[PDB]
């Protein structure tokens, strides 16, 4: 049965078992089964499976990987099956290991773009695995992102964004049919994989971005809501149904403007089931809260001032959003079991 507003029943399971003072980067839960990629700033990626009650150790390593004289930033699951996993550091090259095989490849070329990229780093893959999003730059500084498709990583689209500053953000459409394009002017831009162009372009009233719940608009990828988080500390939540007026609100209204944390935005993540939504700060500890969705409004039981949790610096819901992982800058990954 659906969650409800202002009270959760949310109870701290195990620990993940290993742990090093290295600060933890990445969070992802497996698209399926219940597997932990945890990733750290030295370059080390973990997975472990999900079961507070294994013996001997609980939530027990299923497999690491270090891949050396290479920075590790972000690491992804590919595609609904998550058979693969892509990562990046601060560096012209990625990753892509196949978990079946084993068998981990190098990718640093794309053809006819090589200049365009800065690293690799900044990446999103789309929700269906087909496709990368790389926030890339044009002969004059511009910023834009090159699509590539993943199998081939041959580039296929390209999207434009103004402000001479770049992309602070950005997220694909679940449905996969665009991307949603923070930038760094204070504009955010709706982009179309269908028409390879612009749908259009408004104003947040950012540092990080999310897009979550079921429902949304259609025409605009289906997601409900987009989270933009700034260096104030406010958190700005939009209804993406209030987007369309296809003709873009210059100016729309948040439904929410989220005032809870002073310290600058540094993580915002959605639920799988659109019920949830995180956000929090690394500059102060224990700066994370939770909301419930579509209310908006914050939950007041949890996190408590005893809940340990650190300088947050990375948060992520399992695939049925009964677990939500809180990594932070000291390498601790803990757990909670979240119950309707």
């Given at each position: 049965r659906k969650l409800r507003p202002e009270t959760i029943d949310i109870q701290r399971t195990r620990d993940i078992p290993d742990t090093h003072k290295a600060a933890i980067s990445s969070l992802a839960f497996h698209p399926r089964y219940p597997i932990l990629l945890s990733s750290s700033t030295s370059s080390i990626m973990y997975l472990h499976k999900l079961?507070?009650?294994?013996?001997?150790?609980?939530?027990?390593?299923?497999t690491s990987v270090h891949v050396k004289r290479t920075d590790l930033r972000r690491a992804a699951f590919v595609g609904p099956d998550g058979g693969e996993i892509i990562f990046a550091g601060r560096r012209r090259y990625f990753h892509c290991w196949n978990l079946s095989s084993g068998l981990v490849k190098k990718v640093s070329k794309i053809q006819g773009h090589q200049?365009?990229?800065?690293?690799?780093?900044?990446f999103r893959v789309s929700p269906c695995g087909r496709y990368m999003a790389l926030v890339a730059s044009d002969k004059k500084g511009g910023g834009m992102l090159n699509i590539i498709n993943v199998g081939t990583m041959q580039w296929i689209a390209q999207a434009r964004i103004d402000?001479?500053?770049?992309?602070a953000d950005f997220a694909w459409w679940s449905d996969g049919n665009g991307l949603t394009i923070a930038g760094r002017d204070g504009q955010v831009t709706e982009w179309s994989?269908?028409?390879?162009?612009?749908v259009g372009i408004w104003r947040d009233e950012g540092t990080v971005m999310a897009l979550g719940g079921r429902n949304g608009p259609a025409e605009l990828g289906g997601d409900r809501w987009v989270a933009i988080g700034s260096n104030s500390g406010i958190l700005n939540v939009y209804d993406?149904?209030?987007?369309?007026?296809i003709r873009i609100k210059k100016y729309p209204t948040p439904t929410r403007v989220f005032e809870q944390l002073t310290t600058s935005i540094s993580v915002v993540a959605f639920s799988p089931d659109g019920q949830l939504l995180a956000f929090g700060s690394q500059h102060k500890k224990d700066a994370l809260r939770l909301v419930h969705l579509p209310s908006c409004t914050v939950y007041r039981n949890w996190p408590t001032e005893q809940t340990p949790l650190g300088r947050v610096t990375a948060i992520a819901f399992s695939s049925k959003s009964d677990v939500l992982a809180v990594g932070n800058d000291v390498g601790r990954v803990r757990l909670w079991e979240i119950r309707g």
């Open positions: 079961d507070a009650s294994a013996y001997p150790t609980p939530n027990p390593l299923l200049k365009e990229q800065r690293t690799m780093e900044r402000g001479r500053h770049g992309v994989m269908i028409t390879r162009r612009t993406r149904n209030d987007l369309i007026e």
